[PDB]
Write an enzyme that holds these catalytic residues in place. Structure first.
Site, short mmCIF file in Angstrom:
data_model
loop_
_atom_site.label_atom_id
_atom_site.label_comp_id
_atom_site.label_asym_id
_atom_site.label_seq_id
_atom_site.Cartn_x
_atom_site.Cartn_y
_atom_site.Cartn_z
N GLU A 68 -27.48 -37.33 -21.86
CA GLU A 68 -27.49 -35.88 -21.97
C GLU A 68 -28.73 -35.29 -21.29
O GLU A 68 -28.65 -34.27 -20.59
CB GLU A 68 -27.44 -35.47 -23.44
CG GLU A 68 -27.30 -33.97 -23.65
CD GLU A 68 -25.86 -33.54 -23.70
OE1 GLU A 68 -24.99 -34.43 -23.85
OE2 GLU A 68 -25.59 -32.31 -23.59
N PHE A 97 -21.26 -48.01 -23.62
CA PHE A 97 -22.34 -48.99 -23.72
C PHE A 97 -21.82 -50.34 -23.27
O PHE A 97 -20.92 -50.90 -23.90
CB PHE A 97 -22.89 -49.09 -25.14
CG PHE A 97 -22.92 -47.78 -25.89
CD1 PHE A 97 -23.71 -46.72 -25.43
CD2 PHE A 97 -22.19 -47.62 -27.05
CE1 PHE A 97 -23.75 -45.51 -26.13
CE2 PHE A 97 -22.21 -46.41 -27.75
CZ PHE A 97 -23.00 -45.35 -27.28
N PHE A 98 -22.39 -50.89 -22.19
CA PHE A 98 -21.86 -52.10 -21.58
C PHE A 98 -22.64 -53.35 -21.92
O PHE A 98 -22.06 -54.44 -21.92
CB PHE A 98 -21.80 -51.94 -20.06
CG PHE A 98 -20.80 -50.94 -19.62
CD1 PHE A 98 -19.45 -51.24 -19.64
CD2 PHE A 98 -21.20 -49.66 -19.25
CE1 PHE A 98 -18.51 -50.30 -19.26
CE2 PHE A 98 -20.26 -48.71 -18.86
CZ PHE A 98 -18.92 -49.03 -18.87
C1 LIG Z 1 -33.18 -28.58 -19.85
C2 LIG Z 1 -31.88 -28.44 -20.60
C3 LIG Z 1 -31.01 -27.34 -20.48
C4 LIG Z 1 -29.82 -27.28 -21.21
C5 LIG Z 1 -29.43 -28.30 -22.09
C6 LIG Z 1 -30.25 -29.41 -22.26
C7 LIG Z 1 -29.93 -30.53 -23.17
C8 LIG Z 1 -28.65 -30.54 -23.95
O1 LIG Z 1 -27.59 -30.48 -23.28
O2 LIG Z 1 -28.66 -30.64 -25.19
C9 LIG Z 1 -30.81 -31.61 -23.26
C10 LIG Z 1 -31.99 -31.64 -22.52
C11 LIG Z 1 -32.35 -30.62 -21.65
C12 LIG Z 1 -31.52 -29.52 -21.51
#
Ligand SMILES: Cc1cccc2c(C(=O)O)cccc12
Ligand SMILES: Cc1cccc2c(C(=O)O)cccc12
Ligand SMILES: Cc1cccc2c(C(=O)O)cccc12
Ligand SMILES: Cc1cccc2c(C(=O)O)cccc12
Lengths: 125, 125, 125, 125
Positions: free
Chosen positions: B48, B74-75
């Protein structure tokens, strides 16, 4: 006995049965992404934690489980203001080699915040 | 400027471009599940992190991104012994309302440890 | 030797190697959902077909494969007007018990119409 | 009024409500992959059909839905011998821009044969 990462998430389990696990937790400032809502990876890790706990408990003395995959959808943004979240894992399939569990994370009002499926592999004795 | 959860993961970014992000990290004892391997949720959160960083950088001044969903496989099991992991995010689709990015986590030998897709929604100014 | 459903889809394979499969096909009026675009299930079935063909060819004389799961994203609507689609399956992981393949469906211009991952289980002799 | 591909699948709907759709169908020889079990793409297309029907019915006069993604797990092999399958779509989230529905395909004994989630986008008038 769930490991150090589960503790850092702040999960507190009310129930870990062979067919259901329930845990309470909360958004915390250290769990945020830069726009002040919960980092989405935290939802995935919570989903992984509550499902694997249940899967491991179901397999019991007969072996152990390893995570195979995790698919989590985020339906609402979550902040510290949103209070106590409840994550409930329910079984989809529990077989010889594979388990699939579904986990719903809801707020106090029953609003669905996130929902994930976790596939696990059974390592049997 | 990636938030506190990214720092706690220990990610260190070599690159955040509109079309690729690369980050290095390592299994740590605090990131483990009870059988001494990496908690699977950590793979999802890394996936993420690296994808959203790239997606946010691609959208740039034109708006901001919110996580919609994350599917990580997960491999291989990962431990402290496995050394430095590299997570690379590459774009699948970058459109008006949606982005999809693919993230591969490999060890130094190029062994694929995990791989995830992240869907993001564009909040445009 | 791919079965009757693959024929009904109209897939025509240019290549089925242990590491890649390529097939051409087209939207047809019988493949549509009620609003005149391709039924999304057709994308999933094409993704399943091209990946399983490659996975089966990789396993070869050593056993056979069974579909475990399929996750397909639809990025553009497809009609008869969009002409010839090309679906290419590439391997993500090919191990003892599991295979994961990634399939991209593009139009003649290289526009990504759909993309799916297929997980398969190896039934080894 | 579900399109020609739904008819070719042989789905017969008992119910299409704003909150549930149910359809019956059966494995047929033309729906098989080369080892004599149901082609996995057929499960995905059935999942897509029953969920989109319900999603479209929920949106009603207020607009129309387009498929965004489909993730289906196959839990048991299915043949002509397995008789009549029942696919039930239940809503996970039904919001302004997005819908997510969960579809379970079971045999007469209640054995879970497949299960899929479908994400849809709302095109509102
Ligand atoms: C920089 C940023 C923008 C928008 C979302 C994120 C996420 C997230 O998607 O939870 C995680 C880490 C950084 C993000
Ligand atoms: C208790 C347990 C067993 C097996 C796996 C896990 C995981 C995991 O799947 O990473 C996370 C948390 C707890 C687990
Ligand atoms: C009725 C309807 C509306 C919108 C989409 C669909 C689909 C589809 O998602 O491809 C499949 C079957 C029926 C549909
Ligand atoms: C050739 C082959 C082997 C094993 C599985 C398949 C499938 C399927 O996964 O349903 C679809 C098409 C062809 C297949």
């Amino acid at each position: 006995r769930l490991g150090p990462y589960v503790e850092h998430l702040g999960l507190q389990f009310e129930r870990i049965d062979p067919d259901r696990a329930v845990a309470y937790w909360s958004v915390r400032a250290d769990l945020l992404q830069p726009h002040g809502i919960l980092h989405g990876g935290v939802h995935c890790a919570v989903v992984e934690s509550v499902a694997s706990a249940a899967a491991d408990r179901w397999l019991g003395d007969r072996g152990t489980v390893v995570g195979v995959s995790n698919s989590t959808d985020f339906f609402a943004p979550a902040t510290v203001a949103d209070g106590r979240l409840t994550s409930t894992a329910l079984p989809v399939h529990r077989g010889a080699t594979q388990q699939v569990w579904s986990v719903e994370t809801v707020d106090a009002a029953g609003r669905l915040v996130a929902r994930g499926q976790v596939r696990l592999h059974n390592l049997r004795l």
